[PDB]
């Protein structure tokens, strides 16, 4: 009874493993493996480029963050002034279109 239950357990498992591997061969044909390789290489090139843009952007930020809280207040004041000058220049541009 012990030997019979062992043999039945092993036969059920091997049947399951065989069907999985047959689905994997039906999934990954040589033509698809080539396309999956092109997709991988395009994705890896993207991941590498973005890790490098992220690193450079963080280093420049840390150089400004070293100038302390009073500098960050002066930056906010200048940004608010530059936005107002841009709004006033845009208003002047719309009036001059209306003469023949």
């Amino acid at each position: 009874n012990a030997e019979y239950l062992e043999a039945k357990s092993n036969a059920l498992f091997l049947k399951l493993r065989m069907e999985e591997l047959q689905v994997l061969t039906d999934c990954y044909t040589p033509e698809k493996v080539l396309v999956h390789r092109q997709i991988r290489d395009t994705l890896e090139a993207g991941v590498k480029k973005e890790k490098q843009e992220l690193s450079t952007s963080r280093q420049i930020l840390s150089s400004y963050e070293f100038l302390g809280p009073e500098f960050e207040g002066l930056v906010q004041e200048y940004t608010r002034l530059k936005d107002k000058i841009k709004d006033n220049r845009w208003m002047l541009q719309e009036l001059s279109k209306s003469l023949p």
């Binding site: 399951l16 493993r17 069907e19 999985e20 994997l24 039906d26 999934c27 999956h36 997709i39 395009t42």
Partner: protein
């Protein structure tokens, strides 16, 4: 459960959606699958085919 997931991956093939901004012939893969799906449904309507 792993075998059932392998059967799902074979049935969905999810890799085809990993590059959405690639264009071939001025269209994305999704727009090509949509053109195909529209052409298949038009051909199934015209063939009177009771699916």
């Amino acid at each position: 459960k792993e075998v059932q997931a392998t059967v799902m991956d074979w049935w969905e093939q999810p890799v085809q959606l990993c590059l959405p901004s690639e264009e071939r012939g001025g269209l994305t893969l999704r727009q090509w699958r949509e053109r195909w799906t529209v052409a298949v449904t038009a051909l199934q309507r015209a063939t009177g085919s009771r699916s």
